């Protein structure tokens, strides 16, 4: 049971910081707060003071202050996204917030006990409820329409949170139920079997390449499906055919609508069988994800290196790559961008393949390798980058790149070739119903974080990487 909800778009530079698009207060819950809290009650302020305080605490409003001990103090540690606001000489508690793509989301829930000792957050249901509603709004607004989505929001959530208690957290469902008008226990989030499983395995790899230090790669994957079929209770559970060379499923977690996860999925953390993939679901009007899997394969797909001998102003980046044979030689965008944090005036380069176009800022020369690596599978750049006046703040200041330490930011992508081996199968359909599954499977590859870490310089290291 919340007390109020917000959506404040992030507006840098504006003294107010933004323009509220949603401010609904439920006063039944405020009277309940009086009755429950008692002597520890602190009222909910108006929109203006709330915005000021929340932007102050979120460190999003004029962070140039030298030191504010109410925010930057060594004694006020925020290990969770449930902040505690201080409005009108009263410590408001608890207040939730998070930021993504310049869109803030907030709420103040209800606690059914006195606040004289701050109750542990492993007890207040309202924190979880506020967070989940805010996440649902975030998914709805920026799903994929500039203002027709933000205009209908006040008429949207009222159908979902009328009087301080939520009903459904999917705002698309509020839109479906409001714009468009169930004698059985049909799920409360639902208003020719075709399924569009868009698997996506992003290969992030701090490859490093030392002796004791392990080469750190891990692939983040997901499955987005939908049993968007007619009937009463159609059954379509799809099978993904990882080969014998491929490993079983790894790092499985599921959707809120999903039924459960197998005891192996609980065990196999960071049955071990390639089949039969029996994944219970509940046919949604949403897009059910029967699992999100981060599969492992021992073979890295791409290997790399980097030396930058700081011979004065000679950042000779003698790079050297290694395209494993398992990678198909057709890259949609293999832009091996090479940002130059903490440092091109004179591109005295020697490009083996593809142009090294210094960009107009002359700060980071994004060497576009282009589409395919040479037959030598190696680029190089012995560029006498005679940089001019030393840029100390103009250049992109990245702290994970200091001195001779850096790595090439390869923003490389690939269509329908990832590092896992996903292959959805349809001929093995077993179900207690009948139908024709139109399983439009797919895949992809993205550079989540592919830093070919310079082995001629120190690199940040995780825990198990140094562990033998």
């Amino acid at each position: 049971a919340l007390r109020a909800v917000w959506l404040i778009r992030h507006e840098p530079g504006t003294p107010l910081g933004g323009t509220v698009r949603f401010s609904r207060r439920y006063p039944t819950v405020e009277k309940r707060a009086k009755a429950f809290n008692g002597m520890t009650y602190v009222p909910v302020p108006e929109d203006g003071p709330f915005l000021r305080a929340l932007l102050f605490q979120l460190r999003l409003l004029d962070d140039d202050k030298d030191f504010m001990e109410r925010r930057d103090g060594c004694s006020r540690i925020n290990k969770t996204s449930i902040y505690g606001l201080s409005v009108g000489g009263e410590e408001l508690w608890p207040v939730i917030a998070f930021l993504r793509d310049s869109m803030i989301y907030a709420s103040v829930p209800l606690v059914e006990q006195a606040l004289s000792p701050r109750p542990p957050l492993i007890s207040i249901s309202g924190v979880s409820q506020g967070l989940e509603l805010l996440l649902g709004i975030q998914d709805f607004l920026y799903s994929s329409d500039l203002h027709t989505k933000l205009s209908q929001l006040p008429d949207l959530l009222l159908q979902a949170c009328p009087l301080g208690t939520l009903l459904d957290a999917n705002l698309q469902n509020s839109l479906n139920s409001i714009n468009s008008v169930q004698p059985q226990k049909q799920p409360a989030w639902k208003v020719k079997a075709q399924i569009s499983i868009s698997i996506t395995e992003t290969v992030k790899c701090m490859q490093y390449g030392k002796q004791d230090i392990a080469d750190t790669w891990q692939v983040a994957g997901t499955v987005a499906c939908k049993c968007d079929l007619e009937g009463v209770m159609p059954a379509v559970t799809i099978s993904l055919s990882l080969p014998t060379n491929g490993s079983p499923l790894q790092d499985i977690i599921v959707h809120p609508c999903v039924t459960s996860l197998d005891s192996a999925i609980l065990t196999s953390s960071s049955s071990a069988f390639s089949g039969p993939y029996k994944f219970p679901f509940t046919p949604p009007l949403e897009s059910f994800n029967l699992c999100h899997y981060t599969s492992q394969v021992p073979v890295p797909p791409i290997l790399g290196s980097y030396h930058m001998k700081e011979e004065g102003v000679q950042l000779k980046v003698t790079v050297n790559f290694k395209l494993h044979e398992s990678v198909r030689n057709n890259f949609e965008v293999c832009e091996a961008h090479i940002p130059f944090y903490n440092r091109i005036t004179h591109l005295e380069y020697k490009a083996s393949f593809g142009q090294l176009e210094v960009f107009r800022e002359k700060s980071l020369l994004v060497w576009i390798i282009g589409q395919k690596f040479p037959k030598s599978m190696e680029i190089s750049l012995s560029g006498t980058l005679t940089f001019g006046v030393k840029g100390h703040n103009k250049q992109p200041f990245d702290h994970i790149c200091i001195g001779n330490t850096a790595y090439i930011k390869l923003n490389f992508r690939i269509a329908d070739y990832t590092l896992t081996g996903c292959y959805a199968d349809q001929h093995s359909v077993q179900v207690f119903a009948s139908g024709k599954p139109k399983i439009s499977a797919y895949r992809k590859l993205i550079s989540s974080d592919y830093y070919i870490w310079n082995s001629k310089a120190p690199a940040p290291v995780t825990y198990a990487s140094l562990l033998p």
């Binding site: 049971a1 169930q182 459960s260």
Partner: protein, 551 residues
């Protein structure tokens, strides 16, 4: 624009406009034109939405609230018999006014006319109206305990009949909890409640309640995750002391295979309330593993990660290994606010002291220091370093082996980056004495090591004031004497006498009769010189206690 400009000044500030001259009759007008025909659909909708949103600002007194209740009820009954869009919002607005005005009660005509109406309507835009009425009834029952405990038999019988699953389910669950608590408080039980009373404001039951819980669980398959969480939370409240939980065991075990932010918290609070009755000795291990996994799983946003990172540390034990500590231990690939959620794990692991956890802690804190020393970065980096230092200091006051490197690193970090003066002052003002003293010594040594010709003097003097005592006299006096010539602005000229006042409070007597003298005689601003004169007089002419009582 009849009412748009009218509501603009109110939704700009409710309490400000309602305290103005025009807001005295605002509620009067709004109640008046409720049954009117000159107001279009949109104006009525907007006015009724405001009547929803702020029932506390226009009808404060109980009598006014009752009058508004009867007026709204009248205009709701007297509506034209054509399909329109004022049916549900009117009932909900009347419910809001009655509930938040405090005028609700069995001994009032307005409540006695509203409650049967909502009961009949919700009993069964028909479906949206029924849902809205059911929500209104449940909310009213929440306001006054037992207020809606009249038609429990009706819902029990008609569970398979018309009526949406979620509203009747939630209302039934809330009514069960409130009624059973009240009646058992009296000393009796349901007493046939399974088949509109107002007296609650002031064996077979086991089987009936078992039927109730199985029915609720069966109907909960349609419940959305958020409402499901609150249902299970309140049910775990109710049935902790008042049939085994093996009825709900399959559902709970299945739901723990998820990672949604609400079902996980429902499971966590269910185990933290029910305790160790249903939890196995090893099921706690699987739950801990999954919470730790979800604290760093890429497929989830940062908020879920940090929520479960806070949940794991304060995880509720049933009956009060290293690999789990290696699935969440901090790294430098962690965004600033997700490491401090993981620093306690490393302090716990390294307290009882694979590279040596002290070595990894040294490398991690060294990376944080190197980030902090980078001139030109944001303050988040320094804040990270100092919060991490505080957590380790409080957690590891008692092992000099890991603490000597920490003290040395902090001293070097101060030497590299003098702009971090306030952070150290706060840390010294918080940490316990076992760490307050050696760090004080080493940081004093660092600050007084330089001759005193730097441009960071305005940052040195703050630590000097925050640490000066009677241990190392001559070095401090020499450093301060050298720094006297490098103070041209009032800020440093006040930090310096802050140092002298700290010495004052410490009690040092000899030589200070010359350090304070030279400061008073050789500064720039008159105010600092007078400050020094006063403090020098206080030290020279006071006995030891009277200075603490008269200075």
């Amino acid at each position: 624009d009849a009412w748009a400009q009218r509501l603009g000044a109110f939704r700009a500030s409710p309490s400000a406009f309602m305290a103005g001259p025009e807001g005295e009759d605002l509620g009067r007008d709004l109640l008046s034109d409720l049954r009117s025909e000159k107001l279009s659909e949109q104006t009525k909708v907007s006015l009724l939405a405001l009547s929803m949103e702020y029932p506390a600002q226009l009808w404060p007194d109980a009598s006014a609230a009752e009058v508004a209740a009867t007026s709204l009820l009248d205009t709701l009954v007297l509506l034209p018999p054509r399909p329109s869009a004022l049916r549900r919002p009117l009932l909900l607005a009347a419910t809001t006014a009655l509930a938040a005005g405090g005028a609700l009660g069995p001994t009032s005509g307005a409540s006695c006319r509203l409650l049967p109406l909502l009961l009949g309507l919700a009993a069964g835009e028909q479906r949206p109206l029924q849902a809205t009425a059911c929500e209104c009834l449940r909310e009213l029952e929440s306001c006054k305990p037992g207020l809606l405990g009249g038609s429990l038999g009706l819902l029990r019988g008609l569970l398979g009949q018309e009526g949406p699953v979620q509203p009747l389910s939630l209302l039934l669950a809330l009514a069960l909890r409130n009624t059973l608590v009240l009646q058992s408080r009296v000393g009796a039980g349901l007493g046939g409640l399974l088949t509109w009373d107002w007296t609650l404001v002031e064996p077979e039951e086991a089987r009936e309640l078992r039927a109730a819980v199985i029915q609720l669980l069966d109907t909960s398959y349609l419940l959305t995750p958020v409402a499901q969480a609150q249902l299970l939370w309140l049910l775990g409240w109710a049935l902790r002391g008042l049939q085994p939980p093996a009825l709900f065991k399959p559902q709970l075990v299945r739901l723990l295979g998820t990672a949604q932010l609400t079902l996980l918290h429902a499971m966590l609070a269910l185990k933290a309330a029910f305790g160790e009755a249903l939890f196995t000795a090893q099921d706690e291990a699987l739950l801990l593993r999954r919470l730790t996994l979800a604290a760093q799983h890429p497929a989830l946003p940062p908020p879920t990660h940090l929520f479960y990172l806070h949940c794991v540390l304060s995880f509720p034990e049933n009956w009060p290994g290293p690999q789990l500590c290696r699935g969440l231990l901090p790294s430098l690939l962690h965004d600033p606010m997700a490491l401090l959620a993981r620093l306690h794990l490393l302090c716990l692991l390294c307290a009882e002291e694979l590279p040596s956890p002290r070595h990894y802690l040294e490398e991690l804190l060294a990376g944080l220091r190197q980030r902090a020393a980078l001139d030109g970065g944001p303050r988040a980096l320094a804040t990270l370093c100092f919060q991490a230092s505080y957590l380790v200091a409080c957690c590891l006051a008692g092992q000099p082996t890991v603490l000597t490197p920490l003290i040395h690193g902090l001293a070097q970090l101060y030497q590299a980056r003098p702009m971090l003066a306030p952070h150290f002052v706060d840390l010294l003002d918080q940490v316990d004495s076992e760490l307050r003293e050696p760090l004080k010594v080493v940081l004093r040594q660092v600050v007084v090591s330089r001759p005193g010709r730097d441009e960071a003097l305005c940052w040195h003097l703050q630590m000097l004031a925050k640490v000066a005592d009677g241990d190392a006299q001559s070095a401090t006096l020499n450093f301060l004497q050298a720094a006297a010539a490098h103070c041209t602005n009032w800020d440093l000229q006040q930090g310096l006498l802050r140092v002298c006042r700290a010495l004052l409070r410490a009690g040092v007597r000899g030589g200070l009769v010359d350090l304070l003298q030279v400061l008073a005689r050789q500064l720039e601003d008159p105010d600092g010189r007078d400050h020094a004169r006063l403090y020098y007089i206080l030290l020279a002419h006071l006995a030891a206690p009277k200075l603490g009582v008269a200075l």
